Nucleic acid binder design. Structure first.
Ligand SMILES: [Cr+3]
Length: 325
DNA sequence: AGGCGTCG
DNA sequence: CGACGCCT
């Protein structure tokens, strides 16, 4: 890190713009700038120098100036000091609560995790559960806790129907020592693009894992997507395994590749990739890779038979999962 | 970038 | 339906 202090600053200012003023364009600018400055190879000494870079203009250079000269930013020390702002900000940390709900709760005097516990009547189900395991949801999952969870998923999945194929993607398939949650791609030959859909295919697995006391809560659930909570076994012991977040997704059999690409990559990697796709004249999805036609229309999906196959369409050095950060 | 599920 | 929150 050559310019950590400037980046941290722009990222902090970015969150404030998203979570408090809800100014999406500023949020984007600060994010784009931070990312551009972190790749710059020299130590920045003026805002004038920083301004030469793409994505950083006057408002960001002024801030970088003030930061270099004084070791801080007045705008930010005041943001950190404003109680409505920090409260609005902290509540956004609860899964289910975004900028709107945060600004409505604070507007009504609810600011603390404790106040929240005195006001579940204001919270929808997702938010009540997110409030319930707020602390556990903060804890990161060690890769060892992950491998255990994987066996439980794969094993139960076949017991129900051996034709079921489950793959834990996310940061696991990318080679990480710890992950925020468990992301599992699911496929079954009964679910296919040329079939009349199939909701019962995901419910079965979910109810199954629910029965072994694995899946404990449900935030959201549907035909292709499950978002809930899971937990590992303990017999007579204190500090049972913390409750974990688990996302499950049912993709069509004949589209498994676009599915692993999407549920693996990285929110950042996928963004950068779906950007290229458009450049070359294609539309990458979690389902298909249909090409861009006329002035604004994508047609029939190209056939893929590996992730490698998808990249080659937009001409790229196959990015091995562990590189997709 | 692209889209799934919830809310009212 | 739009707006929101969330997924990568
Ligand atoms: Cr994950």
């Amino acid at each position: 890190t050559l310019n950590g202090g400037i980046t941290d600053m722009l990222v902090e200012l970015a969150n404030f713009e998203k979570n408090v003023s809800q100014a999406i364009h500023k949020y984007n600018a600060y994010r784009k700038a931070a990312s551009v400055i972190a790749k710059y190879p020299h130590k920045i000494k003026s805002g004038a120098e920083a301004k030469k870079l793409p994505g950083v203009g006057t408002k960001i250079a002024e801030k970088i100036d003030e930061f270099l000269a004084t070791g801080k930013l007045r705008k930010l020390e005041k943001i950190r000091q404003d109680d409505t702002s920090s409260s609005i900000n902290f509540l956004t940390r609860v899964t289910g609560i975004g900028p709107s709900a945060a600004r409505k709760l604070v507007d009504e005097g609810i600011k603390t995790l404790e106040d929240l516990r005195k006001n579940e009547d204001k919270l929808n189900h997702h938010q009540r559960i997110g409030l319930k395991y707020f602390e556990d949801f903060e804890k990161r999952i060690p890769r060892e806790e992950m491998l255990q969870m994987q066996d439980i998923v794969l094993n139960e999945v076949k017991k129900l129907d051996p034709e079921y194929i489950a793959t834990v993607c996310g940061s696991f398939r990318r080679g990480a020592e710890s992950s925020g949650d468990m992301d599992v791609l699911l496929t079954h030959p009964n679910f296919t693009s040329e079939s009349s859909k199939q909701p019962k295919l995901l419910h079965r697995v979910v109810e199954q894992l629910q029965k072994v006391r694995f899946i404990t809560d449900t935030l959201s659930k549907g035909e292709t997507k499950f978002m809930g909570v899971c937990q590992l076994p303990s017999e007579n012991d204190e500090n049972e395994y913390p409750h974990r977040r688990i996302d499950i997704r049912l993709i069509p059999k004949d589209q498994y590749y676009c599915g692993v690409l999407y549920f693996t990559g990285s929110d950042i990697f996928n963004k950068n990739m779906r950007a290229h796709a458009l450049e070359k004249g294609f539309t990458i999805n979690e389902y298909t890779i249909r090409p861009l036609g006329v002035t604004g229309v994508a047609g029939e999906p190209l056939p893929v038979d590996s992730e490698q196959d998808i990249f080659d369409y937009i001409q790229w050095r196959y990015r091995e999962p562990k590189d997709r950060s």
